[PDB]
Amino acid sequence: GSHMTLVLGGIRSGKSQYAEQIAAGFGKKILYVATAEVWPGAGSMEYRVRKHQERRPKSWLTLECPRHVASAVGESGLLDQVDGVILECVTLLSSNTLYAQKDPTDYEPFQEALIEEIEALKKLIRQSPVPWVLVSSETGMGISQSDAETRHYCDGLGIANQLLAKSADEVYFMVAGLPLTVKKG
Amino acid sequence: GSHMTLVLGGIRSGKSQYAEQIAAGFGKKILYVATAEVWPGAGSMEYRVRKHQERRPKSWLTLECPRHVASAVGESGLLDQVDGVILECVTLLSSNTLYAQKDPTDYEPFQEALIEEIEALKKLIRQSPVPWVLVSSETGMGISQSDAETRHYCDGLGIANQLLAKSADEVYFMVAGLPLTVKKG
């Protein structure tokens, strides 16, 4: 019955699997909103993405939008054709926003753009006829103070997660594949 | 009614805002103990610090002491003139202690000095007529094994947080701006 759920956790914390279970709880027909871009060459996410697509249930729909996510989802009209939505993921949305900027070492343009994306998503989810689960990462519990771009990314993603968690009806923090309830109405 | 509260969390986890809410719960007149030094030049924390000071309630008092914090707070006499204290923050107290040492690659002098600071704070808070909330960081849940100074910092801050959490009446761990109760009497 949760209209908006945020699932966050570390690298290999089981957060995607848990979010997908939640989404399957919405209904048979889920919209999978994918924000990762598949690059050519070294460092490509192509293999992981292909295996994700292969394992995806056949009744689910996939929308690939690395940026302007609320705009793209809304104008697709698919929210009226599905039972619920899973957004995978805020981590890559934040990265896409950072590297779209002229100078990744400048915090302000990146932060303003990322907050705009997040507020547009909040607004769309508020109006959405179907529930959403969003996947994001915790990246702020180590020591990443080496370069300005990494510090800026960590700050901006932390702020995005704060905004989403505040709007979300339920928030889960994954530890080794198991959920800790952080927020539940 | 909590005499000593520890609030810790990652980068941009909402821990300062939550600690300030707790402190406002103490009374109108709060002593803000600030351990960050404002440097000249690049990498200065001047902008963030100025905005912090601008947003601070006008009835609060500010004491800037980067080192020997218990000594400085105690000899100021301000504990008898306020309703409660917020210490911001243990992360920078630990950094100040590390870089005050002759050789940051040597673990023992840094660790002994930091434990001395923490024990002096524990003793002062035990004697304090007003409650305290302390802000600190979690930095041990990534991979920071590159240089000796960073490993030493992570160890020492972890030990400081263990000591404080053991003494504290309440301990909160922030996830995306929301508190998880780790300890509550």
Place this chain on the structure above:
Amino acid sequence: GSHMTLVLGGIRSGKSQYAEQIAAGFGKKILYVATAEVWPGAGSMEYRVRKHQERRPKSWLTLECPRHVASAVGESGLLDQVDGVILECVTLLSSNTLYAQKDPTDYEPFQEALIEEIEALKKLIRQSPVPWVLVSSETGMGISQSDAETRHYCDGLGIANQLLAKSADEVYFMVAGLPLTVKKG
């Protein structure tokens, strides 16, 4: 009454002390399974290991096996001679497995070998006449995307922790020396 317990947390999070308390709850005679190798030269863990051995209760038994841990424990026959087991630790088991591979920048051989170790441990613990507590690290909540070997390690350790946490009867996540219950029957 917990047959298998997983204790994980960050650097200097109190996880070893908490696991040792749990193990002492098993009985007087505990098997300490140590996976760290003591190297000669710089970066050696010799000092920490020696102090660990000095503080160890005299009725405990120590088995040093950096690899093929389930095989070594099982063929020692010690499970029939003790009250319980503490495995210290999965972090170093994963590191030992990574650096035993021909090319640490290749994810697949490392991952397959580590999963084999973990499944062998799961099988042994399932058959064990005495309970186990296992110590592991959370390393996935920072930003470690710099080199392939570190990313691979983080992924593999996360997967190992997921497998263990799924099999474990109880799972604890340490924050500043205090346990958060993640799973308890």
